[PDB]
Design a protein around this nucleic acid. Structure first.
Length: 384
RNA sequence: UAAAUAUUGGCGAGAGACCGAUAGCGAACAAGUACAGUGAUGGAAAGAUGAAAAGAACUUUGAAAAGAGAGUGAAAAAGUACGUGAAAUUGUUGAAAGGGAAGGGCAUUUGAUCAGACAUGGGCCAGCAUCAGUUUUA
RNA sequence: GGGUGAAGCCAGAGGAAACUCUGGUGGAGGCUCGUAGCGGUUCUGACGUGCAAAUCGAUCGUCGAAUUUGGGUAUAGGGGCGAAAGACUAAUCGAACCAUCUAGUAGCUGGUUCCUGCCGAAGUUUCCCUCAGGAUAGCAGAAGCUCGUAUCAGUUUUAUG
RNA sequence: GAACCGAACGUGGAGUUAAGGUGCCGGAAUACACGCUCAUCAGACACCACAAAAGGUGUUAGUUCAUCUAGACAGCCGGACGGUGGCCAUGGAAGUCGGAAUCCGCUAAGGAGUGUGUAACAACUCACCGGCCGAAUGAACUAGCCCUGAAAAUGGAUGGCGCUCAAGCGUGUUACCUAUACUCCACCGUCAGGGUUAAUAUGAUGCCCUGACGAGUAGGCAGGCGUGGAGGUCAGUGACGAAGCCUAGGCUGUAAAGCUGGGUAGAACGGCCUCUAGUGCAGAUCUUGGUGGUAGUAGCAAAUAUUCAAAUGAGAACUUUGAAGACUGAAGUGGGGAAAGGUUCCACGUCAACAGCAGUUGGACGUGGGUUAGUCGAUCCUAAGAGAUGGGGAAGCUCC
RNA sequence: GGACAAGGGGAAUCUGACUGUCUAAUUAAAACAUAGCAUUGCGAUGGUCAGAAAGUGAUGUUGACGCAAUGUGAUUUCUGCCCAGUGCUCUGAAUGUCAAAGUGAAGAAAUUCAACCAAGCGCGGGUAAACGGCGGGAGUAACUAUGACUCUCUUAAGGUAGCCAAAUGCCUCGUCAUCUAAUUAGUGACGCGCAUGAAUGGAUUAACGAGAUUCCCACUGUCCCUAUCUACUAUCUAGCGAAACCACAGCCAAGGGAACGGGCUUGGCAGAAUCAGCGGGGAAAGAAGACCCUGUUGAGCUUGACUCUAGUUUGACAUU
RNA sequence: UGUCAGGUGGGGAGUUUGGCUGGGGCGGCACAUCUGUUAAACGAUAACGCAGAUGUCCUAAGGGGGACUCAUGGAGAACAGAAAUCUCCAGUAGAACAAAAGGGUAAAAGUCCCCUUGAUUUUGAUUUUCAGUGUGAAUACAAACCAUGAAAGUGUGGCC
RNA sequence: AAGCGUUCAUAGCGACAUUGCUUUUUGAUUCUUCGAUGUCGGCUCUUCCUAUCAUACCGAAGCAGAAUUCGGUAAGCGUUGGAUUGUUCACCCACUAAUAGGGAACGUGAGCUGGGUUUAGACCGUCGUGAGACAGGUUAGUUUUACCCUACUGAUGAAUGUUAUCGCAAUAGUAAUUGAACUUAGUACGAGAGGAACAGUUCAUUCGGAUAAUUGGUUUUUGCGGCUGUCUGAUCAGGCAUUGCCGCGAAGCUACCAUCCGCUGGAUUAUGGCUGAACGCCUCUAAGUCAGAAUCCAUGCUAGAACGCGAUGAUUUCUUUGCCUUGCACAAUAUAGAAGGAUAAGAAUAAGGCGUCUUUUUGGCGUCGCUGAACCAUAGCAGGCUGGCAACGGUGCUCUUAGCGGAAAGGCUUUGGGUGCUUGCCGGCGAAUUGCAAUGUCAUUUUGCGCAAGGAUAAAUCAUUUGUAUACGACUUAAA
């Protein structure tokens, strides 16, 4: 017999399967579509999620009821120390997809990167990239052959990149290696850029600009096993139920005499790899500056980090990015910011933003005061 | 009122084309016993070391049980968990195969293993030629 | 351990009288709220190869009498007892249990132990408190006896119904 | 695929066909010859797993009738009146609301008129005939293959892949594949018809010759294999090793089975002629006894609670002593009895089993010790009841 | 009442008055009991009841304000009509019927055919707080329903007071009114009511109910819509260590087939060993279907089924 | 009190409470028989297939012999009429024969008139259903004894 | 297709006849199951069908516009909240874009519920003399077991030299959904009444994936503070009341009860068109071709074949006893199957190749194909041992100079040197006996054995630790 009351199904099918996923890093599965007319630039970046904070700003939607008004918003702060290039990879077009031709590396690798190749660093002899470093004692015999090989063949040229994790407050030491594709003019100009940029550092100001849309990529919250009702979002069974009432009652129906793939079951929740789209940037601050949050309306000398600090993280003494809304991931986690694939004329992404005020109260609790100078003005001076 | 006639009980003697310890009486053994039921009643399992206990003195490892040696005897592959010691079922070693079961029948190949008249003085496996019987193809 | 406060007594107020009101005292009832005690409503909760062949929890009914219970004594199977449900009568009840007659009877179910060789069926006719069954003929095997090309044939032809 | 088509079967060898097939899976012509079909849902082989009425200028063949030396159809222009508004009908009917007449002229041809249109005319348009052009066209029907008609539930089935002058549909002509069928030979058994000890060794039940046949449940008869005992007989076998048991050793028989090498073991047991029976097992929710997978899994969670050192001991989460925390809270986890059990009380020794973990502890196990009454109970009296005697029943056990 | 302890309340309808009692382990009720009411039998040589029998018993250490046998079920209020049928009962009239023993006649006797005849049945009377029935079926008409006369069918009588789509109404979710935004429900009226109705008790009703049913107030995770916390499990380890079940085993689609394959046929396919969960399959386990039919198989209960019987009652003979 | 006889006696005892059947039960009879058909041109042949019958009536409606023609139509005769009785012509059965249906029959097997008891006795053989048993019915003789007719004959119940 | 529809058979309808399809109604039948397949509905959850109620894009009208009616390709996407009834069905009150119909053992009971039917208790009416009956009404009545195999949802993992980083993408899955307002405009259209649409702005509905700055919830933070009863002689400071109770309450977890985010290209269907035969015209079609829808396919997102691959990093002692690269012999082990040679134009097929001239091009003039029965290699003991004649070529083995080849390049030409053989043409010695045939053994893989040259001199697990993770593994960190 038929259903009776036809309602929409629980959960999205496309997001199956639901595993742990191997990597903790985001991993960009596709980059933008390239243009040989435009100049050379990086398509992506690496950072760390610090926390969240409120923001008040203007509004210029001629049409809405809140035209030229103060509007409170949600925001996510991202710690982004300077990037360090240390490699080049050639990729050749074949009938069976792309194929890696040759990897090249620089002379002087740091101990942040070299830790990644070992599991037991303290016990090891630290022998990595020693015999490769001897190849650079020939001016550039074996170097410029393989760079000219990548110049002749291959239509795509990516760059190996790692994060600086001695500057950040994390107890990590290890770096995070990652490929970032170069989308620019020609193949020859990509490799000329790459050899000059060995060891050389890269900032965030070169990659991203203010008032721009970004795609975010990172791994979600932990949780673990979880049942049916919270994982999928099914209805509770009545109170008067023998043997459980937080389940699906009927799985399927015999003939077909099997359990269907579409049925909601118990199994792993969280820690999944998701890529979010359209997140507008409000600020691209700098580490070498007192008064980061000093807007033109406010003008009070205070750093972006609140009273006490960011909870389960610490502080920020480097460049950072204020993204609108939420970001998929926990704190202390790696996140890869990607440029948009399609240029919007949507009117949201086009409006020019100017921040009016940023909050810096102790989010570890319910803080009233923003800075210690304000606190000593309200109460004092007893008795310490 | 004896005799010729009866007799799955009792006391005493003979026999068998009868059973051979899941048989034969319920009972070959401390069996109407152990045990169950308020009670009338119900009611099992359990035979075999060796000719002779000669039933393993003495050393050494272990807290001890036992173990390794030694010793008794024709034999301990007879040690009082005892003549012989099958199958289900298990451990070790050796040989072989294994992409949603294995296990069979016909025919080969390879690997293993095994019967069968060349011994006297010092049979098995094929090839060609001319014939017979049955066929096929120019 | 509380609540309610019936008869019976004592004192006052009103009234011309007949009598009528108010205050104490007293402690009635198959009354009433509730502990131990005795029961077993609902959760159709727990457990459901259990702690348990009927228990566990919370919620509930009744709680000074048609009450609850020990020891002794009476009633025994077509009998006993029953404020009556065919209830209870030693986990056994629309007729208990123990032995014997008893290896009760069954047109009904299930099983029925070694090889090759030769022949090879039937589910149809008549009768039956016959229709899941028997008798009777038909079909089958075995043993053969009297004879040795016979007066035969699931067939044809000529003549004729 | 129980039943359809072809064929009925002892064991093997060689040839040849039946029904059905020959792109590949699959052994065998990607043979030969003449047509038809192209499907945005093609079709594909009896019983058999479906399709109809009704339709198509999709294409192929055919039947009956017509016009043709300008076809005539085209297909673009020219005409479409004169008598005439014909009689009638009635507001008005003039070819065109209708009822009947249906005739002439000029004629190349023009109906007393095919419709449009108007109150009725007017105006347009056909029927019929020319003008341009130069060889086949027009109507009505019949059946072939294709298409529309043709909508069901998990993903799906000419057997599948795939096939388009086919590997499809209809028809013809040859080769080739192949059944336990047919022909011929070898061997087995059964049945029939003969011939022969006329001394002439060994079974007259013998020893030969010739011919046909062979499927089979229920059922019947025949000839053999094995098990336990009884009578006879091989002056059978055996402590120099009988019976039993084990064996990817061997030999014989179609088979039931039998004989024999190697190992183990330690007292009896075989063949041939006959007698006799508690004489052969895979099934019975069979009977008794033993052992598996499941599985080192289910589980050992209710009565609030344990901790630190010291001692004994081979060994201590659990025994004994100390210290600290706790609970029952006097309708009690306190102190005594009744029924019921019967040494469980108590000491010394001591852990193979039992105390669903452990154990030096124990209501366990081994060996002993322990209950003292004139006054506390029983004994004595009677209760609801039970029950002899004298008597009377009943064949009587016994009943009142 | 700072912990602990401790009633939710209101307006109705059906039903039994109340306290009480039962299906031990699925039914606690509207069932049973009850006070009250009524009926029947009995004066001891008696009623009711036991026993195989007795010089034997229970009621009864009794005597009608008692013992025995039934119905109804407190109070208020009423209990209408019908003795044809079926029971029960009688100082009813008899001779319609009617046993053995005895009486008579016939016969050689066995026998035979006659009258005579006890109770009990038939015939007559009584009885419904005995079992039961109290229906309708036809018609006549005043006026446009009129409820006064006739008969008579199943026998005798034809539903009186009362109450209702009621736990009793098939047609139905009756029609009208009310409660709601909306009501197959609830309550109030209507009644030719398939098939209501008077101690087989009718109508009403204060208190009481772990009884059934509808609505209103307060209250809330029942619900919109789920979220979080705590202990004890599960989970992992040390030790100890089972049962159910089991032909053989365990991947799908279609086909045909005992008409719904895990094994046959044609395709899809296919990679050691394993751990938490879970309830789609294994037509998953539980029990020789209890429903249904068959059997010439049974048992429990009932009765003008067939054949008997203890007890009791009438008559004859003996005791005499 | 004892023995025998008559009534009462579900208080108690024992036993039965058909079959077929598009499940059973309620209906119906297909359960002993008969006619036509289904039934497929010898016989045989099914269903709760179709249309219908029987559990009797008859001393004459049995048996024999002799007379004579019926249905219906047409033409004529007072009351008399579509229909009473009377007469002639045509008349192969279109009538009648105890009942269901089919077959059979014309100087008759129909209708009327004369005489009677073959609806009698003794026993076997034989067809049909069929086991080639019984039951029922039916057919053909032998030995008798009668009826009827001038006789030949016919008759052992109802034309089959 | 007789009539209806003012006129007019077919806009929409359609009598009298007649062919079908379907198994969501109910009968007919009794093949499967009676040593049991748990029988009514509701709750919960998944997927399939189209005979389409809505939404996308079109055709027809008795379509002026608005509303509605009939049909086409379409199952992509959605289809509700309540009163009464045990109900399926039914009937109402609203909302809505719309409140379409069905299947899956009449889906779904080791998933729940037990109101219904359906046992025993009991009551009422009709029927029966009576026990009892009633497809009449009424009330109270027991819902057992997964620890096994497959299935699904997550999680480890032996083995391809060992270990570690960074990637490609075969295949499988896939998602967005519908409305309201402002403007267009009170404009088109219409006598009026009424009353559109495309583009352009802002917001909502249902659904999905993350997230915790704020608001709300949770409180064993037993963090602070308050209050009862009792116990420690009093005060201070605490125990117990199975978390004693009460108020506020960080951290974490969480809510359309809180905030953010949810893409743009190509090829088609219906349908409407262009050029244009068949059929001298006409025609959207026969050949060819332009636009086109919630359809399909990519882009993007999710997993990553544990028997699909690639690139890069480091590769173990001196007890010697072992590692890698290249040549010796020795030795086992096998080979879906060597036995002269896998011998390189591209495009057309109602057309091409090769050679040679020239208004260098879709150009002239000749010639070949009709099968590879080809073309290159080919005579010597499985190919011996030595001579000359004639060329100055052909080849094998080594070594070097150059370059080309990334799709899986692991191979192709190429200068030169050195060193053999040479059947281009003539000479001189040798072979027997394997006894008349018996594949008569002449390949090519792996492999670890000892040699003797050249070369280099490590990691991962366990234990410990951490929380961005966590049933247990695993994952993420740290540590001379």
């Amino acid at each position: 017999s038929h259903r009776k009351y036809e309602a929409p199904r629980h959960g999205h099918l496309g997001f199956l399967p639901r595993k742990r996923a191997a990597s903790v890093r985001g991993r960009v599965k596709s980059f933008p579509k390239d243009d040989q007319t435009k100049p050379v630039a990086l398509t992506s970046f690496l950072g760390y999620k610090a926390g969240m904070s409120t923001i008040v700003r203007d509004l210029d939607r001629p049409g809405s009821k809140f035209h030229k008004r103060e509007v409170v918003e949600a925001v996510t702060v991202v710690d982004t120390p300077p990037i360090v290039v240390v490699g080049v990879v050639g990729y050749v077009e074949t009938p069976r997809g792309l194929r890696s031709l040759t990897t090249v590396w620089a002379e002087h690798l740091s101990d942040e990167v070299k830790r990644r190749f070992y599991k037991n660093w303290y016990k090891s002899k630290k022998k990595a990239f020693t015999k490769y470093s001897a190849k650079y004692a020939e001016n550039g015999a074996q170097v410029d052959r393989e760079l000219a090989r990548i110049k002749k063949y291959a239509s795509v040229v990516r760059v190996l990149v790692h994060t600086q994790v001695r500057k950040t407050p994390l107890s990590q030491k290890k770096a995070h290696l990652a490929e970032i594709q170069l989308n620019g003019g020609s193949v020859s100009d990509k490799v000329d850029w790459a050899k000059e940029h060995f060891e050389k550092t890269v900032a965030v100001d070169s990659v991203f600009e203010q008032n721009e849309m970004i795609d975010v990529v990172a791994v979600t919250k932990g949780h673990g096993f979880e049942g049916v009702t919270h994982r999928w979002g099914t209805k509770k069974l009545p109170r008067k139920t023998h043997r459980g009432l937080r389940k699906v009652a009927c799985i399927g129906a015999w003939h077909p005499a099997h359990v269907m793939w579409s049925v909601a079951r118990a199994g792993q929740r969280g820690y999944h790899h998701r890529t979010s789209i359209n997140h507008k940037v409000y600020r691209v601050g700098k580490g070498d500056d007192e008064a980061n949050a000093a807007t033109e309306f406010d003008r009070t000398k205070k750093t972006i980090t609140p009273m006490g600090g960011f909870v389960h993280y610490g502080a920020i003494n480097n460049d950072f990015v204020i993204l609108k809304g939420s970001i998929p991931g926990t704190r202390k986690r790696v996140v890869t910011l990607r440029k948009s694939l399609y240029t919007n004329t949507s009117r949201k992404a086009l409006e020019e933003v100017t921040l009016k005020w940023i909050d810096t109260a102790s989010k570890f609790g319910k803080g009233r005061f923003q800075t210690p100078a304000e606190k000593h003005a309200f109460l004092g001076t007893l008795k310490k």
